Swiss-Prot record, chain B:
Species, as recorded: Homo sapiens
Gene that produces this protein: CCL14
Superkingdom of this protein's organism: Eukaryota
Disulphide bridges: C7-C31, C8-C47
Protein name: HCC-1(9-74)
Length: 65, 62
């Protein structure tokens, strides 16, 4: 219960090609900036702005229900 | 970092037995509060208050 939290302090400016993306999560509400971290198929974690349309579109398309 | 960074929003109030500690790092300077993260032998990450004496004592010995 004392695990640290992941926060984003900068955001990628490039659109990560959709075919390279596996997973995402939203950073902790307590972080000082909003953040969506995408995890690629190779295992890299990339901070992105939740307010970018491509971010929102990827998240929509990744819905599993 | 374009990858995310670790921050601590809560600290433990109690000392981790020194023999269960394997490693440590400091959270990112951009974090709102400064944190020392200890890595235990079980592989756990534990947020601690850098102003706690036992934390400073462990950090020095490491």
């Amino acid at each position: 219960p004392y695990h640290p939290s992941e926060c984003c302090f900068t955001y990628t400016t490039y659109k990560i090609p959709r075919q390279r993306i596996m997973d995402y999560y939203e950073t902790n509400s307590q972080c000082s900036k909003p953040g969506i971290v995408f995890i690629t198929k190779r295992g890299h974690s990339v901070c992105t702005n939740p307010s970018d349309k491509w971010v929102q579109d990827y998240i929509k398309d990744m819905k599993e229900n």
